[PDB]
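Hi R.,

Here's the input for the leucine complex you asked about:
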Amino acid sequence: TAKVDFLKKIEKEIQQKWDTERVFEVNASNLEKQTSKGKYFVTFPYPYMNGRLHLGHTFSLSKCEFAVGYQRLKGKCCLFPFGLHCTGMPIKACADKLKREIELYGCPPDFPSKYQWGIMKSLGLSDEEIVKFSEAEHWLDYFPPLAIQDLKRMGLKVDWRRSFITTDVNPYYDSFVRWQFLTLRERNKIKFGKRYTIYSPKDGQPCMDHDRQTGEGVGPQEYTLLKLKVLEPYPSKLSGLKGKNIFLVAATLRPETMFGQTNCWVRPDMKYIGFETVNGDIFICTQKAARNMSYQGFTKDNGVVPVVKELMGEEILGASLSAPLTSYKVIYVLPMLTIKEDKGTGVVTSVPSDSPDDIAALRDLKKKQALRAKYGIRDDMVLPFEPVPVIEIPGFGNLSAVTICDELKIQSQNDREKLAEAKEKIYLKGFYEGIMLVDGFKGQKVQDVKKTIQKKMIDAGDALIYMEPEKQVMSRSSDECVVALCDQWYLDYGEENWKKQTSQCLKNLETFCEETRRNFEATLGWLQEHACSRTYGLGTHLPWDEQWLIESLSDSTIYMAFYTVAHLLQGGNLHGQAESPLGIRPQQMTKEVWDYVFFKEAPFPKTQIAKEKLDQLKQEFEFWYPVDLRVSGKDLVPNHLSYYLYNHVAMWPEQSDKWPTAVRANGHLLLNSEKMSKSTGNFLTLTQAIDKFSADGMRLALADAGDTVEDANFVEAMADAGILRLYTWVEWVKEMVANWDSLRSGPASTFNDRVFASELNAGIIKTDQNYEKMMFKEALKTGFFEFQAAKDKYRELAVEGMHRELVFRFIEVQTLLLAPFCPHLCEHIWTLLGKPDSIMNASWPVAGPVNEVLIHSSQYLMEVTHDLRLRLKNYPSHCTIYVAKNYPPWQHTTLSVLRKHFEANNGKLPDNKVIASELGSMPELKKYMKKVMPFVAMIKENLEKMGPRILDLQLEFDEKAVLMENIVYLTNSLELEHIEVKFASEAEDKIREDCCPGKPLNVF
Ligand SMILES: CC(C)C[C@H](N)C(=O)NS(=O)(=O)OC[C@H]1O[C@@H](n2cnc3c(N)ncnc32)[C@H](O)[C@@H]1O
Ligand SMILES: CC(C)C[C@H](N)C(=O)O
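And here is the predicted structure with leucine in place:
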């Protein structure tokens, strides 16, 4: 239980030595006279500053910590910088929950954990310090220094000096941002206009992906909205807007179908509003509908619902309606008991002919009289209205809905699953196949005339556009967002000649699997304009309409260029207030200066900055770009990373090269197979993990988390079997330096040594491939779990004791396979082996030629040892083992025949049917067609397990002799007395006939 502490200690001292010799500070002025193999540059999406760093953070970024640990050995020079996001809508939303909690309940509060106060005392804060966190700017004081201490404490390979904060509190970053956005307005990628977006009324601004708590992908979804005029007489409750004209307002998606209205659906129990539009009319719907319309300019005042009256639907029942389009000049409001209150307007269009719900429920009101009677509806309001043909889908004729409803045997509006199957297999056809019937459009496929039917209804004033968030959107601040129609500066991602270009960048980008790339391709063709113009929350100010601020997904996109110069500008002061190393004033970074630094061919600008500094920066940036690698969750694919090509494409539109190169999406970290939830008692800040399991102890489990795009897992129990094998290895290397002698002076020629060194070399290679494929689970598997396999194997098979020079080799090479993973343990180990330098300077271990047939021989060996420890738990002293020289007769036939079926079609043995068929057809297998089809099966098994080598008429290595090279170990672990190995020709009938090479038999 104190072995964990054995790890923590050497960590703290190794970290001390590291940043006092400043091992991780790289400069590009130094490393441009010496091209290693090039540069290596990785970034992590700088995280939000509304908290310590949690674990899911650390697993998403482990990925680049290991990339550079590895690529530094491989010899590249590493730049791993770290920025800190605050330009958020997160930091302020939190500060405001805390503000309104202090002011509702006191300091110390008193409530009727789950309140933000209780989360802030969960960080050990005195009372009067949690109070100072109410305006957002105490966060920018507090959390960034904590991220930098939490990162140096995990031991990451990071140039402090290039780090920074992101709101206008940091001047330099702000000047950078303004430069970007001047160039963007300049090149016609930022526009202004009245557009649609998701929008939070409490926020007073657009609510885009990173400002949300729910529905991070949703956007505006359109509807047609129909006006139904209520006709005199009004029902008993519409009485006092004696003046105005009164409208039922209903949401639909199939405007072409509106010819077949027979009525109108409301739910007797639902709460409906009536309110005064902009032109003095009374619209009737749900409060949520109205609020959505208000923000889209339906109301006199934006977002204010002038509520004229309130009521359940039950009072509306029986109102007469003039409806658009339908040749029923008078229809009625009827009760549909099952209306979802979320989507739409609480009023639905009854097209019995093409919605199944509708023909169902209309049947129901016709069917039994008490369904009318309870809602007091007259019969003239229901019975005289039969369904109506408008779409003729080919499969089904005029009346598609009622047709497919009578064949699924429907009887009420609640058979909801049968109904929904119907709506699938009718609606989707209706779009493509369907063909219109009504005059004018007599016979066009609806896919075409849908839009123009709709326009026709708008201009005769009968219908209006209505938007709605698709699935619901929560905001950070907890206000249920709506679409709004508003003034906005925005990014023009729907342009043709920009989407073209960035999707080219996508083709050239490297995603590490096919699915991550289909996500990019998905959102590219989906992405249109993106509203970046905000008005509340921390950040940076739009330099020409300064009431606007830049939202977080839009000032985040090309930030990595700055990462290359921060150390020469802020020098590492996070707020950049400390003077600049280069001496350059923030007030001196005008566009033309940035322009110079970044665009290769810009002109030196009329600036007071001596030419040498500007060259230092231009140089640095040009050395480190492009971005070699960005790492992240599967979540930033549909927003930040799409916007990240798009922007790089538009910034250096010319340099194909300055674009990003590669991008690797892991999933969301789980905890012990559990959604990692602060409420479920199932959670771990990094500050916390690093003291529970050592930082090496942690990183180890974080390699084994996952490399699927699919959500990876973190199991604490395995973090512990990890601290285990680490302390046994360190005690093991203590053990080997203490016994330099009871190892073997002289030549390492024994059979097992060749085997073990050819194995250690195959491990160095598999680990190299797994590191460069960035599969840190398998890089672990090969590089360590099996390195220890092959070490213990040669611990056991070497009865002669193990060879000194080979031991210290394995020590070094293991320790180097591990450095990217646990650099503190390895640093300790490497100074144990007394080497003079820091292990960060080591070259990747070189691999020696790999003896294949050897390793097959030792595999064969090990396998029959397993087999014979099995057959032994039964009943002895003597053993005798038999091994057949040639395959027996029936088997050299069945395997000269699987040789012929393998040789004739590039390796595809036909099915079980062609094989057993042509083996019953050879007479020499008649007594043995009971043993001729298990055998081929076992063959196909290993023909799928260790190569086609099992199809040779003769092995690659003397069986009998390989046996004989290791027999001592066998009698000693098997604890017998003597074992004969006869060549299976002197054995009995059963043994000489059922024994094949590769699977010997034996007796006691
Ligand atoms: C650049 C700007 C637009 C973004 C801003 N800096 C920001 O998003 N900060 S953050 O706090 O949510 O993102 C930090 C990183 O960590 C990854 N990640 C997050 N959660 C998890 C998780 N549960 N499991 C695994 N990985 C996670 C995530 O992909 C992201 O790259
Ligand atoms: C009854 C419905 C099919 C009417 C409209 N097309 C909708 O989907 O809401």
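One thing worth noting: The domain at 220-469 is CATH 3.90.740.10 (Isoleucyl-tRNA Synthetase; domain 2).

Cheers,
M.
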